[PDB]
Amino acid sequence: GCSSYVIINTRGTSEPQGPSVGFRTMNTRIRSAVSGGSEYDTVYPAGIDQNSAQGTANIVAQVKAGLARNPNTCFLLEGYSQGAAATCNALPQLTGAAFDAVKGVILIGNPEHKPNLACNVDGNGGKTTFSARGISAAFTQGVPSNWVSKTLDICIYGDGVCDVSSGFGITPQHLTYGYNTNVQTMGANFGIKALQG
Ligand code: NA
């Protein structure tokens, strides 16, 4: 059980610099159930930059800075949209102690969504987006094999960002994760169990 943890939250699109709309509810439940938490909101020019390399670097730096403060610090990594891509890009850079410290990765509307990974669920926890390809999947690696068992990759059916077969680009579905009640429940239960286990 993690006594001290950081929720690293990497936002999307044109969300303002601050907590993403996508995780607000599940985080209230995680922080309420598991003492010792804090939130770091990844600094990067979301919807203003050419890419998210800055977001990836700040995810990696905050994991390393937290472990330096307290080597038993745990992490949950959360990414929405371009922030889910930036989170996926961080995963290969988090090795040994830094890998062991990250207890769970929650992705919503992931542009790097990859077909047939065990972490893939839809908004209702089923398989309607299980084999889906994300809009960035042809050019990126998505969730590496060694991260699948601690990842939850939620793709709402009709979200063209994580499932190119059910929508073209940013579809209204892409915008709905923060007020999807089963998304928030799945995220909260995954994060609580990751930190307590
Ligand atoms: Na769905």
Coordinates of C-alpha atoms in Angstrom, one line a residue, residues 13-192:
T13 CA -6.6 19.7 -26.8
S14 CA -7.2 23.3 -25.8
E15 CA -7.8 22.5 -22.1
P16 CA -6.3 25.3 -20.0
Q17 CA -3.1 24.7 -18.0
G18 CA -4.5 23.0 -14.9
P19 CA -6.3 19.7 -14.1
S20 CA -7.9 18.0 -17.2
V21 CA -11.8 17.9 -17.3
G22 CA -11.3 14.2 -18.1
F23 CA -10.2 12.9 -14.7
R24 CA -11.8 15.3 -12.2
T25 CA -14.4 13.0 -10.7
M26 CA -12.2 9.8 -10.5
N27 CA -9.4 11.8 -8.9
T28 CA -11.8 13.1 -6.1
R29 CA -12.6 9.4 -5.4
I30 CA -8.9 8.3 -5.5
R31 CA -7.8 11.1 -3.2
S32 CA -10.8 10.4 -0.8
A33 CA -10.0 6.6 -0.6
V34 CA -6.2 6.8 -0.5
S35 CA -4.4 9.3 1.9
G36 CA -1.0 10.8 1.0
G37 CA -1.9 12.0 -2.5
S38 CA -1.1 15.2 -4.5
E39 CA -1.7 16.2 -8.1
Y40 CA 0.9 17.4 -10.6
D41 CA -0.6 19.0 -13.8
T42 CA 1.9 18.5 -16.6
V43 CA 3.2 21.8 -18.0
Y44 CA 3.2 21.8 -21.8
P45 CA 1.6 24.2 -24.4
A46 CA -1.5 22.0 -24.9
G47 CA -3.0 22.9 -28.3
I48 CA -0.4 25.7 -28.7
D49 CA 2.8 23.5 -29.3
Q50 CA 4.1 21.7 -32.4
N51 CA 4.1 18.5 -30.3
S52 CA 4.0 17.2 -26.7
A53 CA 7.8 16.5 -26.1
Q54 CA 7.7 19.1 -23.3
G55 CA 4.8 17.3 -21.6
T56 CA 6.7 13.9 -21.9
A57 CA 9.8 15.5 -20.4
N58 CA 7.9 17.0 -17.4
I59 CA 6.1 13.6 -16.7
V60 CA 9.5 11.9 -16.6
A61 CA 11.1 14.7 -14.5
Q62 CA 8.3 14.7 -11.9
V63 CA 8.5 10.9 -11.4
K64 CA 12.3 11.2 -10.9
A65 CA 11.9 14.3 -8.6
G66 CA 9.3 12.6 -6.4
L67 CA 11.5 9.5 -6.0
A68 CA 14.4 11.7 -5.0
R69 CA 12.1 13.3 -2.3
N70 CA 10.9 9.9 -1.1
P71 CA 12.0 6.6 -2.8
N72 CA 8.6 4.9 -1.8
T73 CA 6.5 7.6 -3.6
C74 CA 4.0 6.0 -5.9
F75 CA 2.6 7.5 -9.2
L76 CA -0.6 7.3 -11.2
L77 CA -0.1 8.7 -14.8
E78 CA -3.3 10.1 -16.4
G79 CA -3.4 11.3 -20.0
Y80 CA -6.3 12.7 -22.2
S81 CA -6.0 13.1 -26.0
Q82 CA -2.5 14.7 -26.9
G83 CA -1.8 14.2 -23.1
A84 CA -2.4 10.4 -23.5
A85 CA 0.1 10.4 -26.5
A86 CA 2.6 12.4 -24.3
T87 CA 2.0 9.8 -21.5
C88 CA 2.6 6.8 -23.8
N89 CA 5.8 8.5 -25.1
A90 CA 7.0 8.8 -21.4
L91 CA 6.6 5.0 -20.7
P92 CA 9.8 3.7 -22.4
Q93 CA 11.8 6.5 -20.5
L94 CA 10.5 5.2 -17.1
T95 CA 12.7 2.1 -16.3
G96 CA 13.9 0.2 -13.2
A97 CA 12.9 2.1 -10.0
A98 CA 10.9 4.7 -12.0
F99 CA 8.9 1.9 -13.7
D100 CA 8.3 0.2 -10.3
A101 CA 7.0 3.4 -8.7
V102 CA 4.3 3.9 -11.4
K103 CA 1.4 1.8 -10.1
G104 CA -1.1 2.6 -12.9
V105 CA -1.6 4.5 -16.2
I106 CA -5.1 5.8 -17.1
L107 CA -5.6 6.9 -20.7
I108 CA -8.7 8.4 -22.2
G109 CA -9.2 9.2 -26.0
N110 CA -5.6 8.0 -26.7
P111 CA -4.3 9.0 -30.2
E112 CA -1.8 6.2 -29.8
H113 CA -4.6 3.6 -29.2
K114 CA -3.3 0.2 -30.4
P115 CA -5.5 -2.8 -31.5
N116 CA -6.0 -5.8 -29.2
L117 CA -4.0 -4.8 -26.1
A118 CA -5.4 -6.2 -22.8
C119 CA -5.6 -2.7 -21.3
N120 CA -8.2 -1.6 -24.0
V121 CA -11.8 -1.1 -22.8
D122 CA -14.7 1.1 -24.0
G123 CA -16.8 3.6 -22.0
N124 CA -18.9 0.6 -20.7
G125 CA -15.8 -1.6 -20.0
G126 CA -16.5 -3.9 -23.0
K127 CA -14.7 -4.7 -26.3
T128 CA -16.4 -2.4 -28.8
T129 CA -13.0 -0.5 -29.3
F130 CA -10.7 -3.4 -28.4
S131 CA -9.3 -3.8 -31.9
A132 CA -9.4 0.0 -32.6
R133 CA -6.5 2.0 -34.2
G134 CA -5.9 5.5 -32.9
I135 CA -5.3 8.5 -35.3
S136 CA -1.6 8.5 -34.4
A137 CA -1.2 4.6 -34.3
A138 CA 0.6 4.4 -37.7
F139 CA 3.4 6.8 -36.5
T140 CA 3.8 6.0 -32.7
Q141 CA 4.4 2.9 -30.5
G142 CA 1.5 3.4 -27.9
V143 CA 1.5 1.4 -24.7
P144 CA 4.7 -0.7 -24.6
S145 CA 4.3 -4.5 -23.9
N146 CA 5.8 -4.2 -20.4
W147 CA 3.2 -1.5 -19.4
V148 CA -0.1 -3.2 -20.6
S149 CA -0.6 -5.0 -17.3
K150 CA -0.7 -1.6 -15.4
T151 CA -2.6 0.4 -18.0
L152 CA -6.3 1.2 -18.5
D153 CA -6.8 2.6 -22.1
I154 CA -10.4 3.8 -22.3
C155 CA -11.8 4.6 -25.8
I156 CA -15.4 5.7 -26.1
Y157 CA -17.0 4.0 -29.2
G158 CA -17.4 6.9 -31.8
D159 CA -14.2 8.7 -30.6
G160 CA -12.2 9.2 -33.8
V161 CA -9.1 10.0 -31.9
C162 CA -8.7 6.5 -30.4
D163 CA -10.9 4.5 -32.9
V164 CA -10.5 5.7 -36.6
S165 CA -13.2 3.1 -37.6
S166 CA -16.0 4.8 -35.6
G167 CA -15.3 8.6 -36.1
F168 CA -13.2 11.0 -38.2
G169 CA -10.7 13.1 -36.0
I170 CA -12.1 14.9 -33.0
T171 CA -15.7 13.8 -32.7
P172 CA -18.2 15.0 -30.1
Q173 CA -17.6 11.6 -28.3
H174 CA -14.0 12.6 -27.7
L175 CA -15.2 15.4 -25.4
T176 CA -17.5 13.3 -23.1
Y177 CA -15.0 11.3 -20.8
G178 CA -15.2 13.7 -17.8
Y179 CA -19.0 13.4 -17.6
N180 CA -19.2 9.7 -18.5
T181 CA -20.1 8.1 -15.1
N182 CA -18.8 4.6 -15.9
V183 CA -15.5 6.1 -17.2
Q184 CA -15.1 7.9 -13.8
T185 CA -16.0 4.7 -11.9
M186 CA -13.6 2.5 -13.9
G187 CA -10.8 5.0 -13.5
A188 CA -11.4 5.5 -9.7
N189 CA -11.6 1.7 -9.0
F190 CA -8.4 1.1 -11.1
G191 CA -6.4 3.9 -9.5
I192 CA -7.5 3.0 -5.9

